[PDB]
């Protein structure tokens, strides 16, 4: 049984307390809403229920940008995303927020981002080499270590939210609409991230999580790339999602996790979790993915995909792993 006061982040815990209230009090942020008519929408790029994203042209200087039209959400959530993007501007592999505009007629707010010649991850993951996976995971870890060091949890890390220009070897972490400031001992909403990338803490309703949530999501991405099984944990709902995790990580460490953090498990799980062994990571190797798997890759994966969020590697610890030695050597 751990501290009755709850979990605390192992790194970057005091970041926001060392900065002024204006840094993290996003409700007090006052954005400068410009005129969206300065941008000509060209073509829809995708996305879903929170926004619609368009390729666009800055009419004044003809520069190619991306416009994200914010579907009706609470103004508070809009201030949070804008403030976080402003705090993170210039960050390593963070998407650059260019402008904050509103449609002159509808007054619907929109965010303007830099354009990156992205390759769909469904297509990119089929052609990634062993070195490519290490390179892009390393660049993604730079983005996560940066935002974590700025006191921010992304909380929606997934392949859809990682833009990659495979020709120029450029990576940008996008979609900061679910990001939040980390404050020690704060309890957070667990309805974040995509189902396939939700950490165990979200699935068992443990609200006192921290940056390590993003590290679970990253481990899910690493597993899907080196094993060519995307997504790796392919649950049908939130209950089945934890079952599919428990069938790989085993149930003993799951119940040990619940006991350590005094988590009251939803009684529905007791009829579906069962008892499962902790599987060996080598069991997912086959002839089609063997060239992407190495002992260093399995060791890193094993140290990211842990129930205990406190035992997961931090972003900086993961960056120092021998799995990235070829990337570090290439400067
Ligand atoms: O919600 C967000 O924060 C957010 C931010 C950026 C983008 C974004 O998407 C792109 C897509 Cl989907 C395709 C292509 Cl070819 C290029 C881009 C791009 O350059 C770009 O910036 C999408 C969403
Ligand atoms: Cl076991």
Author numbering: 2 to 332
What did the article's authors report about this structure?
In this regard protein kinase CK2—a cell-stabilizing EPK accumulating in cancer cells that apparently exploit CK2 activity to escape apoptosis and to assist DNA repair —seemed to be an exception. Since in all known CK2 crystal structures—irrespective of whether based on the isolated catalytic subunit CK2α or on the heterotetrameric CK2α2β2 holoenzyme—the activation segment and the helix αC obtain basically the same conformation which is characteristic for an active EPK. Thus, the classical conformational switches of EPKs are not used by CK2α which is consistent to its constitutively active nature. Previous analyses have shown that CK2α—in spite of a conspicuous overall rigidity in comparison to other EPKs—has structurally rather variable regions.
The two CK2α′Asp39Gly/Cys336Ser structures and two of the CK2α1–335 structures contain FLC21 as an ATP-site ligand which allows comparisons between the two human CK2α isoforms. However, in addition the Cl8 atom forms a geometrically well-established halogen bond with a peptide oxygen of the ATP-binding loop, namely the peptide group connecting Gly47 and Arg48. A similar halogen bond, namely between an inhibitor and the backbone of the ATP-binding loop, was not observed in any CK2α/CK2α′ structure before. A cis-peptide bond at the equivalent position was observed only once before, namely in a CK2α1–335 structure with a cyclic peptide bound to the CK2β interface. Here, it occurs—well documented by electron density —in protomer B of the CK2α′Asp39Gly/Cys336Ser/FLC21 complex structure, i.e., for the first time with CK2α′ and remarkably enough in correlation with a novel halogen bond and with the strongest ATP-binding loop deviation in any CK2α/CK2α′ structure obtained so far under low-salt crystallization conditions.
